[PDB]
Amino acid sequence: AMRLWLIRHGETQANIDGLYSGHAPTPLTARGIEQAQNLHTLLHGVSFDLVLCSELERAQHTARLVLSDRQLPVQIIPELNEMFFGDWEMRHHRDLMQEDAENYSAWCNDWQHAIPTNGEGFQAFSQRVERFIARLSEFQHYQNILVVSHQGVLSLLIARLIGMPAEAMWHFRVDQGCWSAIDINQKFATLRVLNSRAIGVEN
Amino acid sequence: AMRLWLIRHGETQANIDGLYSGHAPTPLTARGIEQAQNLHTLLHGVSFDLVLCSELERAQHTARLVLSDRQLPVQIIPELNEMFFGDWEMRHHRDLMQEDAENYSAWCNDWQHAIPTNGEGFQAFSQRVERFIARLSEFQHYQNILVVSHQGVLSLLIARLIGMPAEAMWHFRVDQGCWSAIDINQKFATLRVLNSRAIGVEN
Ligand SMILES: [Cl-]
Ligand SMILES: [Cl-]
Ligand SMILES: [Cl-]
């Protein structure tokens, strides 16, 4: 009886500027901060047993805002980090087609196998998220787990938990300022909530 | 750019008694009516141009309550009907195990191939929902479609739209009193919301 409460970090400056966000630092905007504050209200009644957060500061900043009233052991997991884009970090799609046309166009036509320049390909990234899924049995005695991460990770986590290939991650888009939930009972994952802005209740 | 707003009908007396509820009539309770009235408040700002509904009066009753203010002709689609349970309609699992032991035991163990007594099996039920997916192109010029149906249909619809086998329908459970949304862009289906109790806004 394990419920994973999925949370994507708030809106960042890189989102407003339409840049690639990977391991590079970018701060939460004023709206992204208030999104995490509203989530603190919407999940105030949930008694989490553990917080799982990415190494990136914008994720940890969100986790702190959702748990302002409270105090709870937070665990920092590098497998929850967004895909590493290498030389493409904090750069726009229009500029990459002119400054790195050869590699970037191959990425646009076959993102599953083309590797971003000096970055992390999709195969290695999906293996890293798969490593986190195999690691969830370590938390078998926690009932409610809060997971603060990024859209590429959370969409892939949903896809693989309920048995789809990694390439099907884009059938699920998780949004900022919302929360999602997935239940795992006897290694069977059930998507219960996806992108809710309502008050969450334990069950 | 098609968005299907999915709504399962509210709580019924059959739900209160824990009975198999398929094609047999069963009324909304006072709570099930209140669920549809709250959904009317949640979706007040969504400009539906079409409402798809099953033949069951309890689903049409829900659609009328969700759209009390608006005027919008309800299209009655028998493919959106719940699975037909035949002689098992409006009966309890505790009683069916004794009175129809051989057939009901087979259904509990091989539910994807065993036929409910004088009912419709899961193969014919999945083909029927598949038939509904095939004629979705008839609604290509509508943008916000309200789909009022039942849990078996809506779970199977989501699973098949994003490319999963019919038997994976139980990785998604559509709850009562909530709304879900799936977007279809160039024959690619995206699950955007699953069982929300928050205010909905159209894309
Ligand atoms: Cl950051
Ligand atoms: Cl029902
Ligand atoms: Cl009815």
UniProtKB/Swiss-Prot annotation, chains A, B:
Record-listed E.C. numbers: 3.1.3.73
Pathway where it operates: Nucleoside biosynthesis; alpha-ribazole biosynthesis; alpha-ribazole from 5,6-dimethylbenzimidazole: step 2/2
Active site: H9, E82
A GO CC annotation given for this chain: cytoplasm
Pfam families in alphabetical order: His_Phos_1
CDD domains linked to this entry: HP_PGM_like (cd07067)
UniProt-listed GO biological process terms: cobalamin biosynthetic process
UniProt key word Hydrolase: yes
Lineage: superkingdom: Bacteria
NCBIfam families the record matches: PRK15004.1, ribazole_cobC
Family per record: Belongs to the phosphoglycerate mutase family.
Protein name: Adenosylcobalamin/alpha-ribazole phosphatase
Organism: Escherichia coli (strain K12)
Gene that this sequence comes from: cobC
